[PDB]
Amino acid sequence: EFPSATAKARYVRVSATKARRVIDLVRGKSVEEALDILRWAPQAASEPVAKVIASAAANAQNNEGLDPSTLVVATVYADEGPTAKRIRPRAQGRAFRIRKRTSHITVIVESRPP
Amino acid sequence: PTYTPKAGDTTRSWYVIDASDVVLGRLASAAATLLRGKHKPTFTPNVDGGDFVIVINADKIAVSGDKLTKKFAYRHSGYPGGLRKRTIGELLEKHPTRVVENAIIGMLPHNKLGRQIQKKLKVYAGPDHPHAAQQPIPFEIKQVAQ
Amino acid sequence: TYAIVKTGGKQYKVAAGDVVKVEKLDSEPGASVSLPVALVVDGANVTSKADDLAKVAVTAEVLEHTKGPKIRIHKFKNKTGYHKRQGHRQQLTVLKVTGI
Amino acid sequence: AVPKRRMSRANTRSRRAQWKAEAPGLVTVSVAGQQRKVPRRLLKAARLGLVDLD
Amino acid sequence: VIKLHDLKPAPGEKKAKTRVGRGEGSKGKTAGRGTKGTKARKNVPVMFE
Amino acid sequence: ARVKRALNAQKKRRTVLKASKGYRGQRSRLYRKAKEQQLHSLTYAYRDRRARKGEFRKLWISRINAAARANDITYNRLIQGLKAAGVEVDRKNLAELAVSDPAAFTALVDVARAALPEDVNAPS
RNA sequence: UGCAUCCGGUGAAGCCGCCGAGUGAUCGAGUGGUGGAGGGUGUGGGAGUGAGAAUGCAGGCAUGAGUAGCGAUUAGGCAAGU
RNA sequence: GGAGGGGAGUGAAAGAGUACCUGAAACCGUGCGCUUACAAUCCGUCAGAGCCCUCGACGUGUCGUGGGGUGAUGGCGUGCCU
């Protein structure tokens, strides 16, 4: 067990698959390494995920009083949030559904020692 | 309850069969028996508790009738017209051990445990084998009477 | 030593102190039933003759009457509508063998 | 054409795992004194100053 | 003393309604009509042969 | 009165889905597909409880045959000799002896070989 | 629902479980968790009383799939800015 | 940047945060245990190795009237409805 701090970005306008694609690069990694990865990652979901990780880090630093050096992304997961529905019109009068998916990106950083 | 082997009960013994003037199916049935473990009272059909079986002088196996020329070992490549047949004499002069192998493999179960049991089968065309360190017991193919 | 005790229309290999589940006996816990045998093995010597065995019994203390596992039957035949649910807990007795 | 049957969870996930991202390999750079991490592709431009290091 | 909770119908006075189409352990899936025909969805007149 | 049937309905669903743990895919997750398998599963269990007696008999026989042929006798003549000697021992315990008391098995083999005739292939 | 009883903010129902029970539908005045306000039992009365199927209806969610496509026949680019 | 969140506070309760009573399932994830990359699987059943957990006992880890989860492997096995 370790001291920890959490963050959640709820109702993010990206899909949970496209969030997981980048989360899987940073799970278990240090916060510094994770933020660098997500900085230099071409995927757009890297930005929200990095915002959340930075938020949890700053929460550990300010609210909980932990050194940002010792921080690891001990847990992180995206959850398929709400899903707005739209109608794309198509050929021959038919109407296909479009799903604007959202995600809840939850991060829990731990201050594991070296 | 009824006995089941547990992780160290499977003892392995090495047997060696001289296949000189011995009938092919006779030998193969005996060897499959030993390889499966039917000769053992610890026999459990979900366990390869059998014994290792060396076969020597496989080239001197005995085949009755015109089987040496009119029994074919067939094989398919997966391709059309990819049926290649080879008689038992052709197979004996090319790859001697293959006839004894194929016989035993057919006499064995066609399953994952059968595959595991094949590994205990060693077949050699001469009278000599390298598995002497294992101290194999000679196994004469008897017939229990009644 | 050990023996092969006949009871419940079946046979059970037992020795003294061995606890065995058998079919229901018309007895009560703490009672000491005496059961016939089919074979006795006092190590090497093997008693197998019927008279020599009928001169022998096996004492066993009834510990408790119990019930076996729940068998759940659901007979089914396709395209008929035939289902038939049924259950079973077989009554059993636990015997601790005490002497042979 | 169309899919005859609902793909099982196992197979769906078996290939959906292949839709991943290769993370970029990073290297250290000492621009403005600080040690930052960039790609080796961008190392030169970072030494120069053509890399927005947020 | 005889209260309202002591009142019971006589034996055999009340037979349970048979409920058809409520499972194959009962008069289910056809309601005793069989498979097909006029008699599977309608009733035939008595004045008809 | 109007009856919301979810309350009575979900019971069989809970039952089936709790019985269908360990199943792959839909068969563990969905009532309609777990139900299909619980039919097959309990049919198979009923069948197999009765075939289990045969399978264990087959196993015991295999082991007895092995031990017997190690004592230089066939299973059939062993059974013949035991029935002639009045040994009511069952194949389960014979197999257990063959595994655990080979000496006692040899003793029973000697008993059976004695009780056999002098020409087993004679009408008598 | 009639009647008679009983439980309940010292935590009802519902839901999730554990431990179990019944020949079966199923049970649990056995237990914990969640939860927050009505329920259980017996005896009768009445039913919008039990769904897995109707190319069933409605909602939600999957599979395909992070796939196709991102809508002409002109073409965008650099610098600077915000 | 905001959205959203974390501390702090209100509240009996924020596992009541204007997306809000309870908050099932499908569905989606994360984590732990077991298993699986020589194998032909109506997907289960019966037997069952090994691993893990648990309850008791003695003695100090092997045994049991045991219970569970996994399942190597073997046998059997042609979905439901109409």
mmCIF file of C-alpha atoms (C1' of nucleotides) in Angstrom, chain B residues 4-7 36 45-47 111-113 115, chain H residues 38-41 47-50 72-75:
data_model
loop_
_atom_site.group_PDB
_atom_site.id
_atom_site.type_symbol
_atom_site.label_atom_id
_atom_site.label_comp_id
_atom_site.label_asym_id
_atom_site.label_seq_id
_atom_site.Cartn_x
_atom_site.Cartn_y
_atom_site.Cartn_z
ATOM 1 C CA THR B 4 -5.141 -41.293 -9.334
ATOM 2 C CA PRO B 5 -1.429 -40.574 -9.829
ATOM 3 C CA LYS B 6 -0.114 -37.415 -8.181
ATOM 4 C CA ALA B 7 2.869 -35.681 -9.689
ATOM 5 C CA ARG B 36 0.134 -46.140 -23.138
ATOM 6 C CA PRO B 45 -6.386 -43.028 -19.589
ATOM 7 C CA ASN B 46 -5.856 -39.306 -18.961
ATOM 8 C CA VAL B 47 -2.185 -39.842 -18.105
ATOM 9 C CA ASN B 111 -5.206 -37.010 -29.423
ATOM 10 C CA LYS B 112 -2.983 -34.678 -27.445
ATOM 11 C CA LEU B 113 -1.965 -37.470 -25.118
ATOM 12 C CA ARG B 115 1.148 -36.908 -29.341
ATOM 13 C "C1'" C H 38 1.586 -28.802 -31.571
ATOM 14 C "C1'" A H 39 -3.771 -27.183 -31.355
ATOM 15 C "C1'" A H 40 -9.415 -29.301 -34.851
ATOM 16 C "C1'" U H 41 -13.300 -27.041 -29.278
ATOM 17 C "C1'" A H 47 -13.271 -38.335 -14.351
ATOM 18 C "C1'" G H 48 -9.149 -35.299 -13.109
ATOM 19 C "C1'" A H 49 -3.283 -33.731 -12.573
ATOM 20 C "C1'" G H 50 -1.275 -29.217 -10.967
ATOM 21 C "C1'" A H 72 -3.520 -29.688 -18.188
ATOM 22 C "C1'" U H 73 -5.398 -34.144 -19.816
ATOM 23 C "C1'" G H 74 -8.956 -38.474 -21.078
ATOM 24 C "C1'" G H 75 -14.107 -40.316 -22.178
#
